[PDB]
Amino acid sequence: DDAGNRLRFQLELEFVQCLANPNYLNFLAQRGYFKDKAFVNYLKYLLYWKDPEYAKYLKYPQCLHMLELLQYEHFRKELVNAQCAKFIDEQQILHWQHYSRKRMRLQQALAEQ
Amino acid sequence: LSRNEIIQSYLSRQSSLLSSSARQLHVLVPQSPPTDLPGLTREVTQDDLDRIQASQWPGVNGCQDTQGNWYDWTQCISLDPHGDDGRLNILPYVCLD
Amino acid sequence: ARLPSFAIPYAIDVLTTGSYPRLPTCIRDKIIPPDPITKIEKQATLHQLNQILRHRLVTTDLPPQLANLTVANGRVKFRVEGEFEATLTVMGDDPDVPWRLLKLEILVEDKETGDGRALVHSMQISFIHQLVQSRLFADEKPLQD
Amino acid sequence: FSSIFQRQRVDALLLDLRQKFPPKF
Amino acid sequence: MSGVRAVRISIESACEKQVHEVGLDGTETYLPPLSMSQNLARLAQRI
Amino acid sequence: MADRLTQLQDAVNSLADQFCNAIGVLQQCGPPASFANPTEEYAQLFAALIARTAKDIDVLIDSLPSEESTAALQAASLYKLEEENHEAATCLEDVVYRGDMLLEKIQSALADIAQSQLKTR
Amino acid sequence: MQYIKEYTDENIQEGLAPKPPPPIKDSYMMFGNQFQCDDLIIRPLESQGIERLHPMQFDHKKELRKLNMSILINFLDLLDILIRSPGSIKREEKLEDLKLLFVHVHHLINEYRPHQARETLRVMMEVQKRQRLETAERFQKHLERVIEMIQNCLASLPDDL
Amino acid sequence: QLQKQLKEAEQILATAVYQAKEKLKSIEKARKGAISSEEIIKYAHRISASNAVCAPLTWVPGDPRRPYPTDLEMRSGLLGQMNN
Numbered sequence: 001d002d003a004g005n006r007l008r009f010q011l012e013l014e015f016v017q018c019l020a021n022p023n024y025l026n027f028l029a030q031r032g033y034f035k036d037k038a039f040v041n042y043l044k045y046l047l048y049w050k051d052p053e054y055a056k057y058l059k060y061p062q063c064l065h066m067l068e069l070l071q072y073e074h075f076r077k078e079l080v081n082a083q084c085a086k087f088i089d090e091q092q093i094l095h096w097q098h099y100s101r102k103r104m105r106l107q108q109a110l111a112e113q
Numbered sequence: 114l115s116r117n118e119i120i121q122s123y124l125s126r127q128s129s130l131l132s133s134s135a136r137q138l139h140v141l142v143p144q145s146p147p148t149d150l151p152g153l154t155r156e157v158t159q160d161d162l163d164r165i166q167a168s169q170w171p172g173v174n175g176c177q178d179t180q181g182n183w184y185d186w187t188q189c190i191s192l193d194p195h196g197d198d199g200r201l202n203i204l205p206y207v208c209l210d
Numbered sequence: 211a212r213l214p215s216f217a218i219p220y221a222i223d224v225l226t227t228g229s230y231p232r233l234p235t236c237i238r239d240k241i242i243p244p245d246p247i248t249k250i251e252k253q254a255t256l257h258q259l260n261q262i263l264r265h266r267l268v269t270t271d272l273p274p275q276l277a278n279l280t281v282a283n284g285r286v287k288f289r290v291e292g293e294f295e296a297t298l299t300v301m302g303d304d305p306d307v308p309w310r311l312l313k314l315e316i317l318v319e320d321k322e323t324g325d326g327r328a329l330v331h332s333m334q335i336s337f338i339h340q341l342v343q344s345r346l347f348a349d350e351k352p353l354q355d
Numbered sequence: 356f357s358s359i360f361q362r363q364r365v366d367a368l369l370l371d372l373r374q375k376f377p378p379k380f
Numbered sequence: 381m382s383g384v385r386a387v388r389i390s391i392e393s394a395c396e397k398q399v400h401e402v403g404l405d406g407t408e409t410y411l412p413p414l415s416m417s418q419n420l421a422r423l424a425q426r427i
Numbered sequence: 428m429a430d431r432l433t434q435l436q437d438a439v440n441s442l443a444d445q446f447c448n449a450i451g452v453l454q455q456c457g458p459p460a461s462f463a464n465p466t467e468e469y470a471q472l473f474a475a476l477i478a479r480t481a482k483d484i485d486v487l488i489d490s491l492p493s494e495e496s497t498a499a500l501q502a503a504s505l506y507k508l509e510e511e512n513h514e515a516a517t518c519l520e521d522v523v524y525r526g527d528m529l530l531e532k533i534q535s536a537l538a539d540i541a542q543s544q545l546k547t548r
Numbered sequence: 549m550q551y552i553k554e555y556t557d558e559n560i561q562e563g564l565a566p567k568p569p570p571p572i573k574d575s576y577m578m579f580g581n582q583f584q585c586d587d588l589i590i591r592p593l594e595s596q597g598i599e600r601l602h603p604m605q606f607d608h609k610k611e612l613r614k615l616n617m618s619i620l621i622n623f624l625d626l627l628d629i630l631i632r633s634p635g636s637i638k639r640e641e642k643l644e645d646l647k648l649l650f651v652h653v654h655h656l657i658n659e660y661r662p663h664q665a666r667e668t669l670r671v672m673m674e675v676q677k678r679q680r681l682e683t684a685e686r687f688q689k690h691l692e693r694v695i696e697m698i699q700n701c702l703a704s705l706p707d708d709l
Numbered sequence: 710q711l712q713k714q715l716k717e718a719e720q721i722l723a724t725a726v727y728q729a730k731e732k733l734k735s736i737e738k739a740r741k742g743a744i745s746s747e748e749i750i751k752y753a754h755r756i757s758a759s760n761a762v763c764a765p766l767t768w769v770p771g772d773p774r775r776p777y778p779t780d781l782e783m784r785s786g787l788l789g790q791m792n793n
Contacts (some may be wrong), residue, residue, distance in 0.1 A: 172493030
């Protein structure tokens, strides 16, 4: 099945890079698909993205760290609170400006001497 | 867009100069007719790899300078192309980690 | 029009070992409790604790009366054969950690006066556990006390 | 959505142990 | 590119400084100091 | 970020921005005519800034690498570095092995001394 | 936003009835909204879409200096347009012209970006190699000290005997 | 006097072999994964052509772009559209 495999491939890759989103994670938590165990079998199944020949395709990288964090299951009972999801979002964005702050520090350290 | 005023124009000045910036420039490098794969076509040898590892090669392993100081790719170069106090600061080319 | 710099160390962290250490660990530390201790590391830490316990026993004035000791698995097993069983274990370094009283047991038994039951209830054994743990935290020469 | 009733003597012995060996924080 | 030869690198990932919590307005707190005997104290407590 | 290349990109964009700013200032504001001094000062400052940006772009261009170090010179050096990294790995493994054997021997010796000293009591 | 529900319905089962991972695609995909067909060049060429001013001599630094000077001289000629004949057709060409020049100044230095990428791998490998040897030497010095330490303590012990 | 000196030698060699086994563990993890260089360069281009893993250089809060997929990419993907 070429077309079925193609659609499963593309749909699964949009799902995991979508699963990089903390807000979509809060949506899945509040709308409560995490308590279903078909979903936990799916999330065990989705760890084939960690292979290099499958991680060759993941344009948004973080999804994989959060994917490990999803397998814990104490995690999925959590994230229904929007405050912790907002905290995860603040930490992701504040990490994302990392090399920019490194650039600012390096340019000011060059500027002072 | 509609109006530019002394204070706002001076803000533009300091922002543009802080983004951008006796000679102390890099030593000029000429054109290079021997290049290793296309130009000179050296069969893979060994002198070139030993030069790229250990010696000083001013087009490949670093940027040389007047006043003599050598800077490889991971370092930041401080220069002064103008006759001012303002110093150009070339950031590192690689930035390991 | 400009193409930003290629950020290779993130890609090296992807393709070699398929994860991302680079994210603030306060996510996993705040939300999730830490990972349970596996095997291997357990045996290595127990072996190091056995060595530290030997070297701590040879310094302290051990009670030489009838307390035959076996460093068995990080537990020094002070057992006088008549009456009393103690298991002791240090937590941290060699010089300054006090002792923990992991299991205390009373071997004195008569199945007639104690009416077919234990001579001392676990309430009183736990009380003596607290008392001897306190006098261990008094930090004298501990084993004599 | 027990106590075997010989514990009076053991308890008096515990009090004598408290006195003869005091706790030390 | 233009069919440049690829060679099998095996690069150690640099794991020296791990950011624990990124503070608001900069100031990351690199928590681990990577000790030795305190690892033994951690794993001895956790057993 | 933080490269000579991103510096050169930002310098070229600052050049284009100084072009648009220079025309938009020096056409919007001027003394009327006759068939001011602040505007003349503005013109001098803008010309100086454009010249400085051009000099900086030229210096950064001189700074980057040459048209020597083609990609095959990078690739062959990478190959040689992989081989020497393998050799350094095995050498480190050998020295670690010798140290591990010596450590296990001295550890067992110290354990036997401790056993004897406790058995004498 | 939605959740693939048919495959998650597939996953709840036992035996060997769960499904395998899909095979790798070596052709056009449609992730997100762009296509991202594989085997793409990292720098798509300038001949696909715009003009090309520079020949295959392509000695990057000389042509970058040429394009810098061409940008400045075309700005001066645009000032000559604004002085002489602002209603000319040429200014539209001129306001296109230096745009093309600016595109090339970006398009050359983007061609330094694979090279920089490859080169950072090289220096990382060198630093990697050096650090290994340093630890080796560090450890060997420690090993030597431990050996002689043991030796002198052994040298002490028959002197007690 | 044998014991204390043997102990200090043991401790120094223990820290030495511990740091050496740390570097050996990292080398052995690097041995497990070995990729061709052009695959690393290509993947680095896909990860940082658009700012996905490293932020744009002039970013202020309220800018639409984010290091996660984003609402528009989700609502315009195959996942949002083709099932709905």
